[PDB]
Amino acid sequence: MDPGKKKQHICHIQGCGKVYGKTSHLRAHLRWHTGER
Ligand SMILES: [Zn+2]
Numbered sequence: 001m002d003p004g005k006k007k008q009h010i011c012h013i014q015g016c017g018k019v020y021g022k023t024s025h026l027r028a029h030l031r032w033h034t035g036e037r
Contacts, residue, residue: 009020013033020026 009023009026011018011029011033016033020029
């Protein structure tokens with residue numbers, strides 16, 4: 001849904017706390033969270 005209330009992309013994972021607007025960035029960012037050890 002384009003209109004209506006908007007939603008922000010926040011790191012649901014307990015640890016981070018940044019802000020995102022594009023979902024495509026979530027993937028690139030997710031790899032950093034999982035790809036650690
Ligand atoms: Zn994060």
